[PDB]
C-alpha cells in the first residue's frame, strides 16, 4: 500500500540525530544572514536580502523583518513561505493572549509557543519540519530588551548578539570581538552593518540589498517604538557609518 | 492521521527508535542528582562553546514542576519541554483532585508513563530525553530522587547521573558514595556534586549548575560565586 | 428517611432509620441506608435510593483501585471529591442524593464529609439529612460533646433517630449503628424501634405525652 | 517474494501469499477430527501440551446450544471468530427467535475472512475451524479456511498429520454415516480416525478432547476422566 | 451562598464573607470559609449556585497556579482579574452556565497599590473601591458612600466594614452566622481570627 | 430579563463640518441597584471610535474582539482600519451570531483619513447598518435620544458648536431614563486631533 | 403527545423460606379497563436455579428479562460455565436497570432462588435499580393488599402470645413450602376479590436444590 | 413523536382446532372522512402467516415494506428456502415486535396495533399481539382498538379457555368471527361493511378471502322508532 | 519496509516472534504452584550498586487473591497491570464476587494482538499471573505477546528460562508444600542468576486463600536464604 513511499520524517538516526532537521538546518545555511544586537537602550535588527534585481520594487518589498506586534519583531532565515506560516499563528497567539489577561504577551511566553509548534512536526504528524530559523527582538516589563532564536528542532536560546542563515561561525566570531555590555543603540547599528559588511557573498554592501530594524524605548517617555527602516533611511545609515 | 509504526521489534528483539534515542540523550550536557541525609542536589553542565549567551533569560536545565520536586534532563531540549509542561499539568490535576500534592514517586511514574506511551502509539517517535526527577513527599522528610529513560522504565537511586561522559561520573559516585553514612549537611552534598561534576566539566566557571531542595518547599539555585568558591576550595585540598 | 453522623473523640458515630415510602405507602421497613463503600469507609442513603447506591459501590471500586495503584489508603478528602465531582458531571440531568461520607485516616483522623447532588461538598463535625432531620439535629445540638464515650455516643446516635422515627411519619421502622474507627468500621446492630420506643420511654422517663 | 509483503498485492501466477502463509499456520497446528451422522456430529480433537508442568490447550468451543467448533492454528483469532459466531447466533435468537443454520453460519464466517484478505494495514485470520450442529436440516459438519473457503462434509481432519484421519473417514464413510441414535458409536469412530494421525504419543486422559450435538443432545464437551470410557 | 464584601483602603484589600451553608430548611454548617487563594497575593471570594461556586473557584485555583509554576511568576490582580472574566462571559453561553459572582481583591506589587474587582456570573468585570453581591450592596452602599475615604487604613477599613455588617444583622431576615473577614496587602494574604 | 435593559446606558453620534463627535453616559447597573460611575462605552482602534451599549458583558468582550481584529488587521494591511471598512467588519461579526447573538448595539464614528470626509453609523444587535448623514442613537434612552436630536441638530455646526449640541442632548435624554446617567463624557474628533470632555451632571 | 409508557396490572410476589423460595405471579395481562390475556407468564426460569420476574410496563419488563436471560449465557460463555449466584444475578441486574437511569425500564423487579448456603434468597428491585435481599416482598397493583397480611401471618408483626398481654412475643418458627403455598393462594384469593386487575390465574415457581418446579391455580374471572 | 394522519380501524383473530382466523376491514379513515375505500389490512408472508394491521396506514405500508424485504433476505443462500428454513409465524412476529420496541426506545413509533396468525412447523397455532409501545401478548382470542371491547366478549364465548381449542371447529369459528364484523360494522363509526379474512389451518393451509361483506342486517326495527320521548308521530 | 502484521512464509507473526527475543533477554521470573499456594519470585538485576532495589517493582498485586510477575521491557507491562486491576475491580462492582483467575488472565490476553497500523507495536514483556478462585483452586499462568495463555504447575519465563524450566521439571510434585516451594524457587534462582543471589537481589511473595497475595519483606526472605544454605551443606 502507501507505506512504500513514506520517507518517514520524524525518525532517529543511530547515531541520535533527527535526519529532517539536521537538513532543514543545512537549508537555512545558504539563506541571507540576519543579525541581532542587544544594548542597555534597545535592540538592533540587520538582515540582507538574497541576490536581488534592479526591477524588484524594494520600497513595498518584506522578506526578512517581519512585525508580531508593537513590542515584538523577528528576523527571517530560510523558507519565506515557511516563516510567513509561523509567523500569523504568532500574531494569532499574541492577540490570544492579550485578550485572556489584558496584557501584552511577555516575549518568551511568544517564543516558547512557536518553538513547541516546530518541535511537534519533528515528533509526529509524518510531515516535514519548517525550514525557518528565526531572531526574535522585543520588549517587556519583566525582563526588559530580549534577544531569542529558534530553529527547525524546536529548541530556543537568548541571546545578547545572534546571528542566523549564512556565514555564522564568522559573524559570530566578529560580534563575540567588537560587542560590549555597556552598549547602545548607535554603536550597535554600527556593529550589525560592519559584520554584514565583512561576512556578505556579495562584492559591497548596499541599501537596496539590505533590511533593518530597530526596538527602542527612545519613544517619547516610558514606552516602546519599532522602526522598520525605509530605503533611503537605510541608506543614510550606511552613509553616517562610512560604509557607503 | 499519521499512523505509521516507526517503534517496532526487529529480528534480535530490539525497539531500534528507542535505543536510538538513548543515544540523543548520550550527546545531551550531563546532569547528576546526589541526596544526602536532609537535601537532594542536582548539579548541570553548560557547555562553553556558546558565549555571548544571555543567562538571564536562556532556559535553565532544572525546572520546578511544583513548589516541592524539580526535574532535570540530559537530551533534546524541546522534547523536554513537552515532558515538563505535561508534568506541571499532572501536578495542579493531582491537587484538584486528591486534595494533596503528587508523591515524587507519582510524578515519576506518571512521566515515564508518557514516555513509554510514545514507544507503541503509531504516528509518533520516542523522546530523546532521560530525566532525574527530585523532591520531598508532602509532610516527608525522606529525601527522594528517581531517573527515567525514553524506554519509559524508572527506578530509584541514592546518586544517579545522565548525559555525555556520565559513566566517568557515576564512576566517582560508585566509589565517593556510602550508603551508611550519605552527606549529612547542604555543603557535604553539594561539594560531593560539583566534585563528580569537576571529573568532567572543563573550566569550574559558568559550566556548572547547582540547585538545592530541602524539605518543605525549600528549592534553591546557587550564583556563580557560591559554586566558584566550592570549585576554589576543591582543588586546594587537590594540590597535596 | 433520617441518617445522621457526628465526629467524637473516639471516631464517628453513624444513624439510619429503614424505612422507605412511595407517598403515604410504606414500600419497605427493612432498608439498608447505610453503604459498605469499604471496610474502612461508610456512605448513607438519602435522596434517591438507587443514585446512593450504585454511585457509593461505584465509590468503593475507585477507592479500591486508588490503593492498588498508589499502595496506601485513600483519604477521606480524596475519596468524598471522587464521588462530588462525579455527581457534579450529571449536574441537571435530576440525581438525587443527600450523603455524609466517613472514615478514618492517620493524617485525617476522624472526618466526614457531607456530598451533594448539586455538587456541594462540604467538611464538618455533625450532619444530619431526610424528612427527619430537624428532629435528630434537636437531640445531637443539645447534648453533643467532643469528650462522650463510645458508649455514650452510640447511644445518643440511636436516641436522635428514635426522635426522628417518633415525629417523622415518613421515618420509622428500625435503627443502624455503626461505630468509625481507624482500624475500620464495627457494626453495633439493628434496632426495631417499635420495641426500641417502649424501652427507652420506661428507662429514660422521657416520651410522657405518649401512654404506655 | 516481492509480493508477499501484504494481502493487498497479487503475484504474477494470481496468489496471494499472505493468504497462503496464514494457511501453513493451520498445518503447524495440533490435528483435529469431525465426523457426522444423520442424528449426532462429533468433534475430537488432540490436545497440545507446552511442557509435563504446563496444561494441555483447549481446542474446542462452545458457540450455541445447538452449534460449535474446533481449532487448529492461531487461538486468539479463534477466539475472535468464536465469539463472532456467539454474537450472529444470539442476534438470530433475540431477533427472529430462530436457531441459526450452521450452512448460513459458514456463510458468515467466510465474508468475515475475507475482507481482511482485500484490504491495506489488515492480515488474514491464522486458524482453521471445524464446525458441527444440529439445526431444522439436521447433522452438519463444516470446514473453514481462513481464505474464506468454507465447505460442508460428512467428515474431515485439519492440522498437522491430518491426511491419516481424512483417509480413514474415506474408507469408513458407508459406515459411519448410518451410525444413527448410537452417541458411543459415532465417537468411537472418531476417536479410531483421529488415532490413524498419532505417531510416538497416544491418546492419554488429558489429552483427548471430545464434543458432540445431536437431535436430544446439546453441545456438550467432554475433557479428563469422563473421556477415559473411550480411551 | 450569600453576603460577600469588599472594601479597598490606603494599602490593602479586605473581603468579608458569610459562614453560613444553609440547605433550604436546616442551616447545615455556620463556619464555611466562602474563599480561595489564587497567588500569594491575590484572594477571591464567591457566591451563587451550590456545587458551582467552589467548583469554579478551584477550578480558576488550579489554573493561576499552573501559570504561576510554568513562568516562575505571579500574575497581577488585573491580569487574573481578566482571566477569571473571560472564563464566565465563556460559560453565560455554554449547555449549563456557571452560576457565580466573584470578588477579586489583590495587591498589585509592581505598583505597591491595593486593587479589588468584582465580577457577576454573566462576566460583568468593574473594578471599584467597594463591592458586593446580590443584596448585600442593597443595605451597606449607603453607609460607604458617606465614610469611604482613599487614604483610609486597614483599621478604619475593618471599623467601617463592622458598621457595614451591624446594619446587615439589623435589616436582613436571613441569619448568615457572621462573616470571615481577610487581608490582602504587601505581606500578604491573613485572617482577622476575631470578628 | 430583556438582556438589553440589564445595565443601562446610552451612546449618541453626531456630525459637523470637517469633524464628527461621539458621547456616552458613565453608568453601569443591576437594575435597580447602580454598581459603577466609571463604565466608559466608548473605544477606539487607531483614528476609529466605537461605542456599544446593552449588556455590559458583551460590551466588554466585543470591546476585546474588534481589538484582537483591528491589531491582525494593522499588522496584515500595514495601514490604520477606516471607519467604512471598520463598519463592515462590526456587521460581519455580529451577523455571524445570528441565533445566539451579542445583546448590543453598537455606534462607530470617525473621519477617513484620506478623504477627510466624517463618518457615523449604527447597528441592531445582529449587524444591520444604520448609515445616517446627520445622527445616530443607542441604549435605554434612545427614543429620549432621537426626540433630543431631532429638533436640537443642525448640519454643518462648527467642533465647539457640535459639542454643546451633543453634550444637550446626551445630558437632558440621560436625565428622562433611570437606567441612564451617573456621568457623561463627549469625544469631539477632528482629522489630526480629538478631545475628550467630561461633563458634570446629576447623580441621581 | 407520545407517551413511552403503559401500566399492564399484574401482581407478583416472593417468599423466602428455610431451604426453597418461591416466586408467584397472576396470569391477567391488561389495558385500562380491558384484559388482553387470561394467561400470559409473568414469572420467568432464567436458568441457574433463577426465577424472575419484572411487574409493570409489559414491554419494558420483557426486554429486561431477555436481556437478564443474555446475561447469563454470556456470563457462561466468559467464565467457564460457572453458575451464576443469586446475588451475583443481583448486583448484575441493577447495572442493567441504571444503565438506563435517565429512561428507565418502567418495572419493579423481583428475583428468587437460593444463596450459596442453600438457603432461600429473595431480592426486590426500584425501576431504577436500588435492591435489597428481603424474606417476603409483594409487587405490582395489589401490592398493598397483600403486604399487611405477610407482615401479620409470615413475620407473627402484632401477635403476642396468650396470657402475657403482650409482653412477650409470638416466636418466629420456620415455615414449610406447603405453609407458605397456603398464604400465597390466600394472598391472591384475597387480592382478587378487591382488586379489578387482579385474577384469572395464579402461577408459582418453586426453587429448592432439586430445580425449579411449577404449579397452576385458577383464580376468578370477572 | 408524530400522530396518526390515515388510519384503519379493528383487527380480529381466534384459534380453532386445526389453525386459525384473523380479519379486518377494508377502509383507511382521515379523522371523520372515510377517504379510502379499497385498503387491505391482512398481508399473508409465505403460505403459513398473515398480519393483520390497523392504526396508521402510512406506517403499515412501511412494515408491508419490510416483511417484503424479510422473504427475498430469507431466500438468499438458502436451498431450504421453500421447507425446512421457511419463515416462521414465530420468527416474522419477533421481528416485528424488536422494531415496535425499538421505534418506541427513541420516541419516533410506529403508530400500529398488530396481530400474527399463522400454523408453525410441527402444525401448532400461533396468535399473538405487538403495539406502537412494544407490548405483546398471546390469548386464544384476540383484538385491536373497537374489536377489543366488542369483539373479544363474542369470540370468547366459543372459546372461553385453551381446552375449548380443540372442541372448535372452522365453520364454527369463521361464523363467530364474521358475526363480530357484522356487531362491529353496527358499533365502531370508523369502520366499513366491506372486509378480508383469512383462514389458516395445518391441514388445508392459506385461504385468503377477499371483497366479503357484512350481510343479514337488522334494521327493519328502526320504523317503529319515533322522537327521543314524548313524540308520538 | 514491510506491515506490522505480516506473517512470515511459516505461518508466523514477525513482531511476535521478534517480541519473544526481547522477554529471552529480561531478568528471570519463576512460579510454583502448589495446594497451599502459589510462589513468585525474580531476579532484580539491578544495573549500577547507587541504585535503590527495594524501587524495583517486577512483582506487583492485581487484586487480594492475584498476583503478577514480569519479565522483558518492564516498561512495557504497566497498561497490562492497570487493565489486569480494572478488570478485576469492574467485574467485582458488576457481580459482587471475585473474578477467576483464568478470566483475569483471557482478558490481559485479549489485548495482546491489538496492534497494527490501537497501538503500534506487541508488548515486549511475558506475564507470570498466580491466584486463587473456588472453582479451580491455586492456579498459574503464562501470558504471552501472542495473546495465547498456558496454565502451568511451575513456569520459569526470561534469561534462565530453559535451564530452570528443566530444574523445575525434575523438582515439582503434586504434594510440595509451600515452604518447600519458597526453597525451590529460591534455589533456582540462585542457579541461574550472574550475581549472587541475596535478599536485596532477589524478591520473593505468594498467594494463599487465607492472606491473600502478600510480597515478602527482605527480612523474612534472608531467613529462607539461610535456610537453603544450610539444608544444602546438609548433604
Ligand atoms: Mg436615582
Ligand atoms: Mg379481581
Known sequence: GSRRYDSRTTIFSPEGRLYQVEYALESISHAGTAIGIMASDGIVLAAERKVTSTLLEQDTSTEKLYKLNDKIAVAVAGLTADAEILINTARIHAQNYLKTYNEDIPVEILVRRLSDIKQGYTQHGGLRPFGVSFIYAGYDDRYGYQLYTSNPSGNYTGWKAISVGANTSAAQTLLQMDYKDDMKVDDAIELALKTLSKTTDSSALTYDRLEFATIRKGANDGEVYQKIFKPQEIKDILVKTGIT | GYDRALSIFSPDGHIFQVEYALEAVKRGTCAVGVKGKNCVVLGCERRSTLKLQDTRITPSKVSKIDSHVVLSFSGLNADSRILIEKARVEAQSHRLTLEDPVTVEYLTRYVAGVQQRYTQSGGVRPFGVSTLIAGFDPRDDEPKLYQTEPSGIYSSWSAQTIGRNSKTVREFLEKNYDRKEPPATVEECVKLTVRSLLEVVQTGAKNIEITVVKPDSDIVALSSEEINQYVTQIEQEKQE | ?212 | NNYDGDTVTFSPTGRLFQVEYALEAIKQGSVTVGLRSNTHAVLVALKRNADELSSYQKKIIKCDEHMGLSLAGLAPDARVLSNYLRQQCNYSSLVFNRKLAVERAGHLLCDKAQKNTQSYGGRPYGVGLLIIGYDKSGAHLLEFQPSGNVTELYGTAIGARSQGAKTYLERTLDTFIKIDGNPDELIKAGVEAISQSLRDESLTVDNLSIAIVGKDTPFTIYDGEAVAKYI | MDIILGIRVQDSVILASSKAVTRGISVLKDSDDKTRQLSPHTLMSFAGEAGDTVQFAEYIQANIQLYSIREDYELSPQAVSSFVRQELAKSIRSRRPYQVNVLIGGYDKKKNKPELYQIDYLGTKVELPYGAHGYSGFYTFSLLDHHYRPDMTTEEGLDLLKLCVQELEKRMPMDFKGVIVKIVDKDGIRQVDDF | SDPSSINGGIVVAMTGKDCVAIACDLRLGSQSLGVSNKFEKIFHYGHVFLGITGLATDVTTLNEMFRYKTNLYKLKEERAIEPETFTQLVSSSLYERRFGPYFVGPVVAGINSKSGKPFIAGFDLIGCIDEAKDFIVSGTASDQLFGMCESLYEPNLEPEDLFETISQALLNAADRDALSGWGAVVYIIKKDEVVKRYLKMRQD | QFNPYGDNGGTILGIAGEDFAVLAGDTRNITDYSINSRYEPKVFDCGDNIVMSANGFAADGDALVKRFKNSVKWYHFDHNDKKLSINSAARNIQHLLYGKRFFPYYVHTIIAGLDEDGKGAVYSFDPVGSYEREQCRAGGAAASLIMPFLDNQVNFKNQYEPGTNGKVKKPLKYLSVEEVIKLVRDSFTSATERHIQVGDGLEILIVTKDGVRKEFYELKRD | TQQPIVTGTSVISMKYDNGVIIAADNLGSYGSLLRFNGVERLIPVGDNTVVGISGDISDMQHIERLLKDLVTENAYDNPLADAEEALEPSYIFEYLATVMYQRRSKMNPLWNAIIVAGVQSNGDQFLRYVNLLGVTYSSPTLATGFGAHMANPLLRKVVDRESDIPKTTVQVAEEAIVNAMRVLYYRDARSSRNFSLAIIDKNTGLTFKKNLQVENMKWDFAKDIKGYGTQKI | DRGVSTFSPEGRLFQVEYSLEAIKLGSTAIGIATKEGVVLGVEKRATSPLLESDSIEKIVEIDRHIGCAMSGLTADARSMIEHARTAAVTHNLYYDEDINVESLTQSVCDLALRFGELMSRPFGVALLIAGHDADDGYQLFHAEPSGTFYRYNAKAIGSGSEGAQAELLNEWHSSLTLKEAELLVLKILKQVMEEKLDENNAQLSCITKQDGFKIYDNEKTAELIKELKEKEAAE
Open chain 3, 1 to 212: 428517611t433520617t441518617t445522621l453522623a457526628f465526629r467524637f473523640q473516639g471516631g464517628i458515630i453513624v444513624a439510619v432509620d429503614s424505612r422507605a415510602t412511595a407517598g403515604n405507602w410504606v414500600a419497605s421497613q427493612t432498608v439498608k441506608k447505610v453503604i459498605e463503600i469499604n471496610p474502612f469507609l461508610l456512605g448513607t442513603m438519602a435522596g434517591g435510593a438507587a443514585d446512593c447506591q450504585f454511585w457509593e459501590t461505584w465509590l468503593g471500586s475507585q477507592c479500591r483501585l486508588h490503593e492498588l495503584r498508589e499502595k496506601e489508603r485513600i483519604s477521606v478528602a480524596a475519596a468524598s471529591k471522587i464521588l462530588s465531582n462525579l455527581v457534579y458531571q450529571y449536574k441537571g440531568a435530576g440525581l438525587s442524593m443527600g450523603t455524609m461520607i466517613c472514615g478514618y485516616t492517620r493524617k485525617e483522623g476522624p472526618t466526614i464529609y457531607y456530598v451533594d447532588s448539586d455538587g456541594t461538598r462540604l467538611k464538618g463535625d455533625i450532619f444530619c439529612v431526610g424528612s427527619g432531620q430537624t428532629f435528630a439535629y434537636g437531640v445531637l445540638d443539645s447534648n453533643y460533646k467532643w469528650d462522650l464515650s463510645v458508649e455514650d455516643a452510640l447511644y445518643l446516635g440511636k436516641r436522635s433517630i428514635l426522635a426522628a422515627a417518633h415525629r417523622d411519619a415518613y421515618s420509622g421502622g428500625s435503627v443502624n449503628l455503626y461505630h468509625v474507627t481507624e482500624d475500620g468500621w464495627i457494626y453495633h446492630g439493628n434496632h426495631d424501634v417499635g420495641e426500641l420506643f417502649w424501652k427507652v420511654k420506661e428507662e429514660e422517663g422521657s416520651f410522657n405525652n405518649v401512654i404506655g
